[PDB]
């Protein structure tokens, strides 16, 4: 989570940015703090570009705008003047990405320890199938390269999270000598 103050002088008749939300009617539905949605490539806002739209103005013109209704936010900008020295908070970039790995079957199996699905989601709150242990010189070890920490949401087109640890386990082993597994990175890091 990043934080810092900045001055946005009215390039002319305004800064140029779209906001929405309010401590009463959150723009997302779970954040009393207001944030911006987009900036117009014209006003001083886009020119100053000292912040992102999805940020959270921790403070504006020395006014409490961390969890106040929209009307109060509009009033803050209404009495902002021109050179608004506001303090915003922009969270770091996420980390949600879907990978595609190749894992070949082996005589002793695929050579890896994974657990997901209902009944045994492995993780205390995640039906997704995550890995926990890998053998040496295994099929997935060398090919898959899925070190302890990866999580597969589906093998090519399988539902490794729509049955149970048993069905997902049987569905993973039921794969072919050479199957592509769909892995995913921990969103929001």
């Amino acid at each position: 989570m990043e934080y810092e103050e900045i001055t946005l002088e009215r390039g002319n008749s305004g800064l140029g940015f779209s906001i929405a939300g309010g401590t009463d009617n959150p723009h997302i539905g779970d954040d009393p703090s207001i944030f911006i949605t987009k900036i117009i490539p014209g006003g001083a806002a886009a020119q100053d570009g000292r912040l992102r739209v999805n940020d959270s103005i921790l403070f504006v013109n020395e006014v409490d705008v961390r969890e106040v209704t929209h009307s109060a936010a509009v009033e803050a900008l209404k009495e902002a003047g021109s050179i608004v020295r506001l303090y915003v908070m922009r969270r770091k970039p996420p980390a949600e990405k879907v990978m595609e790995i190749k894992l070949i079957k082996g005589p002793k199996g695929l050579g890896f320890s994974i657990a997901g699905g209902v009944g045994n989601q492995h993780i205390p709150g995640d039906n997704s199938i995550y890995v926990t242990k890998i053998i040496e010189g295994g099929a997935a070890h060398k090919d898959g390269r899925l070190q302890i920490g990866d999580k597969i949401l589906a093998v090519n087109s399988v539902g490794l999270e729509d049955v149970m640890h048993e069905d997902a386990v049987a569905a993973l082993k039921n794969t072919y000598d050479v199957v592509y597994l769909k892995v995913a990175k921990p969103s929001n890091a």
């Binding site: 305004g14 800064l15 140029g16 940015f17 779209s18 906001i19 929405a20 009617n25 949605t37 117009i40 929209h70 936010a73 509009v74 900008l77």
Partner: peptide
């Protein structure tokens, strides 16, 4: 939502 819209300022 329905009546209130974004503030472009």
């Amino acid at each position: 939502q329905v009546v209130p819209f974004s503030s472009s300022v």
